[PDB]
Amino acid sequence: RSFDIYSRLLKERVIFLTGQVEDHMANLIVAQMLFLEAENPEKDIYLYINSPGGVITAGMSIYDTMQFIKPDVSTICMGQAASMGAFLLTAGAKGKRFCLPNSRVMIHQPLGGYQGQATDIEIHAREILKVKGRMNELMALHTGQSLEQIERDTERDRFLSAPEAVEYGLVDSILTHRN
Amino acid sequence: RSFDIYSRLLKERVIFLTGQVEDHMANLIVAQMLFLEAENPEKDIYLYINSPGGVITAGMSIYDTMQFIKPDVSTICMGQAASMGAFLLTAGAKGKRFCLPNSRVMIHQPLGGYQGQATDIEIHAREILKVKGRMNELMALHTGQSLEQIERDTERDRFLSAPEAVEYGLVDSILTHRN
Amino acid sequence: RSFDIYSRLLKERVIFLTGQVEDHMANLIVAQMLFLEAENPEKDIYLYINSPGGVITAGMSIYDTMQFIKPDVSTICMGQAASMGAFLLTAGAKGKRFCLPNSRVMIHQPLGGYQGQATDIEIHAREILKVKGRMNELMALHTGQSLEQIERDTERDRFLSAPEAVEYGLVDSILTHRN
Amino acid sequence: RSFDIYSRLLKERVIFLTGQVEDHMANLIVAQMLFLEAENPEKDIYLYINSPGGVITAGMSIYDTMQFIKPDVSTICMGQAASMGAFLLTAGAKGKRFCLPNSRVMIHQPLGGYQGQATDIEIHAREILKVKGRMNELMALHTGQSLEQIERDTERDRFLSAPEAVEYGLVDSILTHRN
Amino acid sequence: RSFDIYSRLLKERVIFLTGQVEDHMANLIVAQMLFLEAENPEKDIYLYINSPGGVITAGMSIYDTMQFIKPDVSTICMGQAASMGAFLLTAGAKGKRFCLPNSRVMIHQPLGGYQGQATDIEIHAREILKVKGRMNELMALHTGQSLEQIERDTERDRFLSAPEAVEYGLVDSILTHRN
Numbered sequence: 019r020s021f022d023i024y025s026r027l028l029k030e031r032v033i034f035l036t037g038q039v040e041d042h043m044a045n046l047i048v049a050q051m052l053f054l055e056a057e058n059p060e061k062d063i064y065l066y067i068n069s070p071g072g073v074i075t076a077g078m079s080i081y082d083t084m085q086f087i088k089p090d091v092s093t094i095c096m097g098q099a100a101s102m103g104a105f106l107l108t109a110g111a112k113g114k115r116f117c118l119p120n121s122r123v124m125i126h127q128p129l130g131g132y133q134g135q136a137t138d139i140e141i142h143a144r145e146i147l148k149v150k151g152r153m154n155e156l157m158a159l160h161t162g163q164s165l166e167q168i169e170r171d172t173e174r175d176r177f178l179s180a181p182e183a184v185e186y187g188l189v190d191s192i193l194t195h196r197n
Numbered sequence: 198r199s200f201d202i203y204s205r206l207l208k209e210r211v212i213f214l215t216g217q218v219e220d221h222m223a224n225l226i227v228a229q230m231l232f233l234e235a236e237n238p239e240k241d242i243y244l245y246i247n248s249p250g251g252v253i254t255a256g257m258s259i260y261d262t263m264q265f266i267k268p269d270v271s272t273i274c275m276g277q278a279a280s281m282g283a284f285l286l287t288a289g290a291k292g293k294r295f296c297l298p299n300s301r302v303m304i305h306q307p308l309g310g311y312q313g314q315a316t317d318i319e320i321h322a323r324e325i326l327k328v329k330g331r332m333n334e335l336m337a338l339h340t341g342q343s344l345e346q347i348e349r350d351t352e353r354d355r356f357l358s359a360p361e362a363v364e365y366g367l368v369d370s371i372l373t374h375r376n
Numbered sequence: 377r378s379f380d381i382y383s384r385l386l387k388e389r390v391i392f393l394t395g396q397v398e399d400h401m402a403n404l405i406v407a408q409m410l411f412l413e414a415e416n417p418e419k420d421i422y423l424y425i426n427s428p429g430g431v432i433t434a435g436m437s438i439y440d441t442m443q444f445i446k447p448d449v450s451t452i453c454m455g456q457a458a459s460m461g462a463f464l465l466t467a468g469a470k471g472k473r474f475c476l477p478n479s480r481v482m483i484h485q486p487l488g489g490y491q492g493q494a495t496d497i498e499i500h501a502r503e504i505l506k507v508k509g510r511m512n513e514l515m516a517l518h519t520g521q522s523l524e525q526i527e528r529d530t531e532r533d534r535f536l537s538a539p540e541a542v543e544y545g546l547v548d549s550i551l552t553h554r555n
Numbered sequence: 556r557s558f559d560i561y562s563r564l565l566k567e568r569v570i571f572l573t574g575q576v577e578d579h580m581a582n583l584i585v586a587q588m589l590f591l592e593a594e595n596p597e598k599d600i601y602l603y604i605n606s607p608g609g610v611i612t613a614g615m616s617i618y619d620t621m622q623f624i625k626p627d628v629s630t631i632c633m634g635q636a637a638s639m640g641a642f643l644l645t646a647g648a649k650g651k652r653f654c655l656p657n658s659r660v661m662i663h664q665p666l667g668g669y670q671g672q673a674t675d676i677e678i679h680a681r682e683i684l685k686v687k688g689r690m691n692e693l694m695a696l697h698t699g700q701s702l703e704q705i706e707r708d709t710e711r712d713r714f715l716s717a718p719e720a721v722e723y724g725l726v727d728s729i730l731t732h733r734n
Numbered sequence: 735r736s737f738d739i740y741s742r743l744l745k746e747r748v749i750f751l752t753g754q755v756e757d758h759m760a761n762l763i764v765a766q767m768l769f770l771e772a773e774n775p776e777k778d779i780y781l782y783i784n785s786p787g788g789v790i791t792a793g794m795s796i797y798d799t800m801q802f803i804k805p806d807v808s809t810i811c812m813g814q815a816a817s818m819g820a821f822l823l824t825a826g827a828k829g830k831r832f833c834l835p836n837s838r839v840m841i842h843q844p845l846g847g848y849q850g851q852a853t854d855i856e857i858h859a860r861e862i863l864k865v866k867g868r869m870n871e872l873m874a875l876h877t878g879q880s881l882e883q884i885e886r887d888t889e890r891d892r893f894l895s896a897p898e899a900v901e902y903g904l905v906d907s908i909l910t911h912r913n
Contacts, residue, residue: 053385077455078454078478078480079476096262097256118257118258118262159706177320194264194265552700555699582750589743615813616814620812620834624912678891679891
């Protein structure tokens with residue numbers, strides 16, 4: 019009886035990624051993902067996305083589980099998919115990634131901040147550059163775009179309307195009307 | 198019986214949109230729409246609106262779900278419908294957008310801001326202005342008012358009574374007594 | 377059923393170690409493991425990790441549990457698993473420790489701090505060294521390096537990507553894709 | 556018999572695929588497979604492969620036919636399997652793909668070339684890419700690697716030894732001695 | 735025996751049209767058909783096609799022959815069927831035109847060239863124009879589309895995947911497995 023709306027939508031194999039991406043909320047998407055694999059490792063899974071990004075590693079826990087699990091993971095971004103939100107979005111299974119008409123996307127680069135000794139600082143700094151780069155490769159690969167474009171387009175906050183994210187390979191098309 | 202009051206009204210295809218428009222409440226509304234559509238994609242969906250407005254990207258996520266789903270979304274304004282609230286009110290299926298007798302409407306332009314490097318400041322400013330356009334075009338369409346007209350009317354706050362709102366074209370008519 | 381997704385997943389014998397490691401969530405993990413050993417001391421027990429590190433005594437309460445129960449413990453890594461979370465990872469039963477593709481490890485030495493009289497400062501100072509003392513050996517032993525290598529490698533913060541993770545013998549291998 | 560050693564070995568349901576891959580020698584493979592199918596639809600077919608690759612269409616006419624026919628087509632790699640030779644190698648029935656101890660494998664992306672007007676250059680440029688894309692998907696399937704693991708690794712000539720090719724999902728096992 | 739494999743297959747009414755289309759390999763195809771019509775003028779005849787195209791007149795001796803003989807020539811494309819190749823594929827008996835999964839099709843208008851006195855060039859180009867006219871007509875026919883539609887689609891090389899091919903009307907369906 020729509021006792022719990024989301025639990026109910028989990029029976030249509032739909033999952034919601036909303037807001038701040040961080041460990042726990044991420045973990046709750048993983049746990050859903052896995053649960054759906056088992057309930058049926060053959061049917062498609064739905065990941066709706068309206069988020070501004072967040073802690074990356076947490077963000078990556080979702081990503082790897084989207085690949086790891088048997089079923090294809092379709093993604094539909096509504097409202098906004100930014101930074102890490104844009105990533106998991108374009109990480110949907112090819113041909114199954116969407117954008118509602120006025121949703122909007124944003125890309126940019128790994129953000130961070132360490133504090134301590136010079137020695138330690140080079141350590142964590144070298145690390146963020148590696149991640150900055152991997153994230154760029156994994157993005158080059160899901161978008162079909164060169165490492166040059168990503169690198170340039172992601173050095174600074176960059177926005178895309180629904181048409182443009184399609185035109186960029188980020189999502190495959192625009193769902194305008196449930197026909 | 199009436200355990201959970203809202204659940205039961207969701208069974209009468211009634212969803213409430215109350216207060217500030219932000220990611221998590223806007224998301225619980227979209228899910229209500231998806232659930233209602235899944236249960237019966239033909240009967241209209243009734244959306245009551247009493248909100249002061251809020252986060253645009255969160256609003257649009259509601260906007261696109263409304264226009265997406267096959268079922269028509271009848272929007273009803275009680276109390277007030279400001280900014281993103283008015284926006285969503287004027288987006289109910291043409292013909293089924295209402296205002297209870299004393300609800301109130303106000304409209305304006307997007308509010309926001311950035312902080313950072315001039316370069317980054319310019320990217321974010323053309324982006325909110327890119328949205329201002331798209332938002333103004335969309336207003337024009339739903340109300341029938343000309344783009345160029347909605348602009349003049351949105352540089353500043355503009356209040357609308359139920360009557361003037363019927364005339365501005367934001368709503369179709371006034372609901373006074375259940376007949 | 378699917379009231380608590382973590383509850384349901386606990387059925388497939390899957391336990392999650394998530395976020396900061398401390399006395400109460402650690403214990404919650406200790407109980408889930410104990411609970412499984414009762415429901416089948418023969419079937420494997422899965423333990424997902426995405427921890428940024430935590431407290432030591434509490435970390436051990438777990439460790440010592442993974443070693444005390446009869447069921448084996450396959451640790452899988454998603455997102456990250458620093459400090460105590462890298463330990464517990466490489467503490468999984470041999471050949472059943474894994475790192476998803478973009479997950480990341482990071483190992484270092486026991487952080488702490490004390491306050492008060494000199495006599496006691498030495499007392500707790502001696503004690504911390506003994507803990508690092510004992511921590512390093514166990515790392516060597518679980519990984520395979522020499523109490524000296526491990527030693528080196530953990531004086532400062534140190535990262536290892538998924539691959540570099542196996543090579544150092546922290547994890548048996550990169551848990552690729554549900555095949 | 557021995558009058559014609561290959562004809563004699565076809566009787567034992569064995570087909571050799573040797574050297575450059577082009578329409579004609581490929582047609583002959585397709586014709587030996589079609590022919591074996593017609594003689595006995597249930598018995599395996601052994602496709603020995605020692606090729607440096609060649610023309611992709613010519614090969615695809617061999618991959619589709621391989622999959623299409625009812626019999627299981629086991630693939631044995633001797634000497635070398637590169638490019639289209641490695642694709643076809645990995646395309647044999649699951650479990651029934653092998654390598655001899657010193658077979659060496661090499662995978663890489665598609666090669667092509669067009670000459671003409673920019674407009675036409677466009678079509679051809681984008682078709683070669685559509686092809687690289689379908690090709691990378693199929694290598695994902697038959698290997699278990701993720702679409703992104705293959706685009707990554709085939710981005711450039713990658714050499715795999717017998718055990719690495721087993722360890723990678725290209726072939727199922729290494730045949731050393733007949734027993 | 736299996737001395738000649740294309741012969742054994744001929745007995746199964748299978749004819750291969752491989753690579754370049756020209757008078758002599760065309761004439762061989764044509765005679766193979768007349769032979770199968772005399773054998774048994776009722777049974778279908780299968781024609782596999784893996785060809786980049788070729789000389790038009792040589793192609794029409796094949797086309798006119800397929801239509802002329804009582805037997806229904808089913809057509810099945812492996813690898814690729816470009817230009818006159820694609821023309822012939824779609825010229826197969828109705829409902830009896832196929833494409834294996836990853837075979838590809840390419841369509842386009844007639845190519846040619848003359849050398850001489852203006853008058854002769856006039857008489858010759860006029861002619862290549864009559865042929866384009868008839869080539870397009872016959873394609874509209876066999877595929878279902880309309881004259882206007884083809885000429886549009888065919889002015890420049892155009893690629894079609896097995897699916898797109900069926901969607902377009904060149905082939906009736908995609909053969910995937912022997913059921």
